Amino acid sequence: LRLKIYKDTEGYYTIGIGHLLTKSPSLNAAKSELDKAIGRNTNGVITKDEAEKLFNQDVDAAVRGILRNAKLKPVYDSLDAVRRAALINMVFQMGETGVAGFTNSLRMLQQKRWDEAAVNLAKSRWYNQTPNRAKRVITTFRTGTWDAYKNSGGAMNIFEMLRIDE
């Protein structure tokens, strides 16, 4: 919940709840992208209300990306509400295209084969780069519960979930 510009684990300027601003190594460019999104000269600082609006727009986009993708929509429609949030999180983090590439894992979710889907996902580049997170997401896919988020504050929705993962 950063109201001020900060860098993600890859060095990219960002703000709020994981809202990427630019890949450019320039705070000037980052602030400029920020002003357009907010609708006022921010000098790199936004309010709690502004950060939440960006967040809600980012979650809304990940769902739209899912519904628009031929490989994800079928899987998403077949899932319970908690497992849907896990899929939403993966898309929010890597994009519809990235998640669509997990053929087996997705096929396994479609067939309610939780364990196998968890096993495969752990065998990904995604998992190797952000394991703490992928571990919580995969446990959510495996159990259909928010149990993996309890120690870090708890979560009952995608909003509280994403708040913790990034």
Task: Cite the annotated binding site for substrate by residue number.
Answer: 20, 92, 105, 120
Q: Quote the CA–CA distance of 137 and 139 in Å, as a whole number.
A: 6
Task: Cite the annotated binding site by residue number.
Answer: 20, 92, 105, 120
By annotation, the residues acting in catalysis are 8
HEC profile of 15-56: EECCEEEECCCCHHHHHHHHHHHHCCCCCCECCHHHHHHHHH
Provide CATH code, domain 1-166: 1.10.530.40
Q: Which helix (H) or strand (E) holds 14?
A: strand 13-16
Method for this entry: X-ray
Declared resolution, Å = 2.5
